[PDB]
């Protein structure tokens, strides 16, 4: 009843609605992977790195990088998440003075995008033209990376 195109997925990897789709082979998200011991927020500077799921960190368990508009970052998350960027809620972005690249995500079009955080707070995508995440419609984050 959200009436959206792109599904969100539970912590077992099952879509809450619609058909499942696979992640891009070169995305930083590697599935299958466990998640959901807690909802643990973090910051851009301290995003978890590859390998961190083994030991976790001082904030608690780590499953990977999650992001939603705000921007808000998590190192683990329990609720439904996007496995692909929901391009229905993105639009063309204008120039960004300073960016931080945080991963590589599959788009809802099946294509591979670099994902960034702009200094203005916007979440940006670039293929391999820039798009920005303008609508936090479902308030579900995008699972960017498996740690
Ligand atoms: Zn892992």
Numbering used by the authors: 17 to 144, 150 to 168
The authors write:
The Npro protein is a leader cysteine autoprotease that cleaves itself from the nascent polyprotein during translation of the viral mRNA, freeing itself for innate immune suppression activities. Npro has a unique ‘clam shell’-like protease fold that is distinct from other known proteins including all known proteases. As predicted, Npro consists of two domains, a cysteine protease domain and a zinc-binding domain.
Here, we report the crystal structures of CSFV Npro and a C168A cleavage site Npro mutant to 1.6 Å resolution. This construct was intended to trap a substrate-bound form of Npro; by mutating the cleavage-site residue, Npro should not be able to catalyze self-cleavage at its C-terminus. Unexpectedly, the C168A mutant was active and the SDDG peptide at the C-terminus was cleaved, as confirmed by mass spectrometry (data not shown). The C168A Npro crystals belong to the spacegroup P212121 with one molecule per asymmetric unit and a solvent content of 54%. Since C168A is as active as the wild-type Npro in our hands, disulfide bond formation is not a required step in catalysis. Thus, although Npro does not require Cys at the cleavage site, Cys168 is conserved in pestiviruses, suggesting that the residue may have an additional function other than participating in the protease catalysis.
